[PDB]
């Protein structure tokens, strides 16, 4: 009873044809699924397995292993906040506070509208620009509440 | 049109790896070609594979992934094994403090690509992979585009420049696991599985991707290869000291005025990195410690060490995280404990329970809720993460924290 | 191993002429065969000549050499005359901005060879020629090797595939004269003489090589023939508009982001070629003019024309040289004048003296050293290259320059 | 008198035997002679004419007609630089200037050692890769002086 939209099915198929073996495309497909729905829907896993020619069990264990994928909370925009040594030293707490002031949510939570979810992550490889956060694929240095608010206004 | 990227400061005294990547923007193939790009490749293809290995060997080039393994020698091991063989560029860069590889990927992709083609050719690999972390989406798209540019200019595909050598470079993305930067877990991930390290030996060069001889090298390592061919190994070895020659990248962060990536020779001292290059400390406060990523902790008494791979040297990835006099070392240790907690893959029991317990008990200590047993327990688990470990995460997960216990006893005693 | 060749970018929406030549490398016979190559030939040899002519006729195939003459019609004319008959592939491609034919020659030689064999069988020629300019040395060596490959597989020689049909293809090299691209001067050159055009009529199909019926076709033209036989003429005619059907190549150069050869249908507009396919202009500057090689000049008010052989259409070889708003039109016209100066063969007096004086006076104008009589003289000679001319060089040597004069008066007027 | 060395005479004979009629081989023969000597020797036309069974006059007329053949200047390497419209517009002058910096010569000139001659030519049929040059049969796009210097160093 579960079928991928055609515009998504095509993209998945592109990834599967890209490497010499189909199963190498698994994480790219999953990224694409999450990109499309705002999360990994559990019911998407069965047919992804078929296309990969993998057991469902293999696929489920992969989703659970890799921290970027999320099977619980649908969100349009994921605010990834680095909570590692350098960002913590240079003001992660000030960033989290500003996010709470603007949006009304803490790490782990989703805004009532389903728009924004704050995800605490380990070092994002931009430590010299600490404290660092991402908004989906975009990545920024936090300067101040007013600066953060302007940035967030660009995601509608 | 790529995703937004912070503009990391970059500076070079050598003008090699950062010749273009010192400018915070994508340099497309035309600019690369104008600077003499891809001429090293052309010279490489008119040499034998064996000759290229000799040059890389004689260059003294070591790995920039953190272990400093001689690159020539790695290649030589691979080619004594029957083909087919695979080449892998490791762009997982997920060590705390470490952001040196990304500026090459994002700013000068063709330097990396050129390196991959020459190295693949040197070891007889017709298929190569870049494995880039999922949290670098911009680097991913930038690499995809750059590979297309190279194809169109005939630097990739079949029969490259009439040489008879075939190569495709595939770009894979990670999805959140630090352990996937471990070379055998990376391979497992490339095979479409969970990132569980494999018992070594065998090393990848004997048995790697699909069980075939596989060379894994770090981004920075690979980016050196065009220079070695262009200058020749003799001229390259004139840079820095003759035992640890050539450029090295140093990502500096924390309490420095000019945080960013510095291209420097390896006779540079740690004190020079912080004070001569990175502008000294914020507020001219005294240096308390330097964290070499999540690997080592250096005190203020250890700043006059060379940034080389000697026994007494800084070593590692060159990651310099500076803490000053007001920074609480126990707080910083907690952050390091939390990192390992989040990244153990759990295959090995002392690493699984040890990484969790070190972080859990240290949190209690930090918060002033630790019993006498919690204290004694923390000490014990710190010393007992490594037994039975099959990869380097379990081997080092206690290491830095142990060093803070030895080097800053007064601060730890405050918490007890 | 062949001489070095720049890797011209090539892109196709139709995946026919450029199905293999979109990749910048030699495709040898095994690859060609694997893709179903030489099957059109086999199917051709099971058909009568007359039928092959009929399909090519109904395909609406026109000459890709620049004049757009109906190919099937040309063949029908030749076969009305008593044999023996000769077939000639014109690979002299020497018009400014035109580099479409060479990527077929250099990357997919068997598509051309297959086309020559079918075409030769269709008109009863047992002997065929490729005349390739001398500045294409790599194309020459590549063709020579591909012909041997075809021989070894029994696609050339006597009694090809048991059909009773005999063919040898000889490869001739030019030696620096644009005029040798003119079909009658081409033939003179093949006869071992200087490249002097002859008065048409007679056209080659009546009297050509050694005075015998001869079909001259362009490389591109001939490369369509395998497809026509393969798909049938009906499926071929679905490509593009019904009247001007089939693929056409467009070599695009100058101030565009993606210069190269585009395989496109002929209902594409000139605007589409530049902005949709060639990626727009360098610096996103406004288009000022397009030079159709050295033949026509289109203004920015003429970009919405079809790339067909209609009266209002672009026509020609499909050559698109783009100039933008900063480019001096007089400077550019001087370059077109200089070209014709260097390539008049000199048999016809107004062409001989006209091409020379056009360049010589226009240079004076350009450098600001022209008398009033020089100006009036320039005007006059531009209008008087054509009279008594026996070939198309004389008929057009003033055409483009006259067009700049009419379309950009303000910029010319400023040279006073 | 002048007589071709045996290894060249052989190659001339192969061309003469290739076409159905000897006289069709004239241009291949002349390309061959130029490849061998670095130019067309005036004293080579007489014996070539006998091999082609053509009058000397006919052969001389042909050499004068076809621009690729040079009877004046020996050179080991001919740098053909396109001077037509597309190359001029995209930077022929930068290539020529770079050539003067490296080699010390301008179009028409030979270096003292007889090694490089610069020959300005009309469109080479590589306009998309403008500005274009050849070194004998090798053809390249010019990118910069540093790139050109590297290429020229390949010809010893
Ligand atoms: N850059 C980052 O983001 C990052 C992240 C985590 C860890 N690291 C680094 O990882 C390092 C540890 O890595 P490791 O466990 O791969 O180190 P290692 O010393 O075990 O291996 C180094 C390299 O040499 C090869 N090698 C070693 N001995 C060999 C032998 N006998 N035969 C053949 N090949 C041999 C290995 O295959 C590997 O490629 C640490 O020093 C740390 O700095 C870097
Ligand atoms: N591709 C290049 O490199 C290049 C270079 C220079 C010029 N050109 C083109 O050359 C064109 C001029 O060529 P042309 O003077 O040969 O054109 P044309 O119109 O005189 O003839 C075109 C073709 O049709 C044939 N033909 C025409 N009428 C015929 C008839 N009644 N009976 C039999 N055959 C007939 C001719 O023999 C010839 O093969 C220009 O339009 C220009 O674009 C192309
Ligand atoms: C837990 C963990 C994590 C990583 C590594 C190791 C371990 C134990 N290694 C080192 C890797 O296994 C290997 O040594 C290098 O990639 C080999 O390349 P070089 O010889 O340094 O070029 C590693 N290397 C790298 O290039 N990038 C990375 O992100 C990581 N991450
Ligand atoms: C001065 C000059 C120069 C050329 C031409 C014409 C003139 C007047 N023609 C056109 C040629 O004479 C003839 O029309 C074609 O070769 C016929 O083939 P198609 O009918 O186009 O297949 C021409 N054609 C071609 O195929 N290649 C070339 O390089 C040239 N060059
Ligand atoms: S040491 Fe730790 S990270 Fe490494 S394989 Fe064992 S459990 Fe996994
Ligand atoms: S018009 Fe010009 S090029 Fe043509 S035959 Fe006459 S003189 Fe020669
Ligand atoms: S510690 Fe936050 S990006 Fe590195
Ligand atoms: S204008 Fe120079 S190659 Fe065409
Ligand atoms: Cl299943
Ligand atoms: Cl805190
Ligand atoms: Cl957390
Ligand atoms: Cl510079
Ligand atoms: Cl059949
Ligand atoms: Cl005589
Ligand atoms: Na910075
Ligand atoms: Na960057
Ligand atoms: Na990862
Ligand atoms: Na696994
Ligand atoms: Na190894
Ligand atoms: Na080509
Ligand atoms: Na010619
Ligand atoms: Na004709
Ligand atoms: Na004409």
From Swiss-Prot, chains A, D:
It comes from the Bacteria. It is an enzyme of class 7 (translocase). Its EC number is 7.1.1.-. PROSITE patterns: COMPLEX1_24K. Keywords: 2Fe-2S, Iron, Iron-sulfur, Metal-binding, NAD, Quinone, Translocase. Its cofactor is [2Fe-2S] cluster. InterPro entries: NuoE-like, NuoE_dom, NuoE_N, Thioredoxin-like_sf. It catalyses: a quinone + NADH + 5 H(+)(in) = a quinol + NAD(+) + 4 H(+)(out). [2Fe-2S] cluster binds at residues 82, 87, 123, 127. Binds 1 [2Fe-2S] cluster. PANTHER family: NADH DEHYDROGENASE [UBIQUINONE] FLAVOPROTEIN 2, MITOCHONDRIAL, NADH DEHYDROGENASE UBIQUINONE FLAVOPROTEIN 2, MITOCHONDRIAL. NDH-1 shuttles electrons from NADH, via FMN and iron-sulfur (Fe-S) centers, to quinones in the respiratory chain. Couples the redox reaction to proton translocation (for every two electrons transferred, four hydrogen ions are translocated across the cytoplasmic membrane), and thus conserves the redox energy in a proton gradient. This is NADH-quinone oxidoreductase subunit E.
UniProtKB/Swiss-Prot annotation, chains B, C:
FMN binds at residues 174-221. It catalyses: a quinone + NADH + 5 H(+)(in) = a quinol + NAD(+) + 4 H(+)(out). SMART domains: NADH_4Fe-4S. Keywords: 4Fe-4S, Flavoprotein, FMN, Iron, Iron-sulfur, Metal-binding, NAD, Quinone, Translocase. This is NADH-quinone oxidoreductase subunit F. The keyword Mitochondrion does not apply. NAD(+) binds at residues 63-72. [4Fe-4S] cluster binds at residues 345, 348, 351, 391. Its EC number is 7.1.1.-. Its cofactor is FMN; [4Fe-4S] cluster.
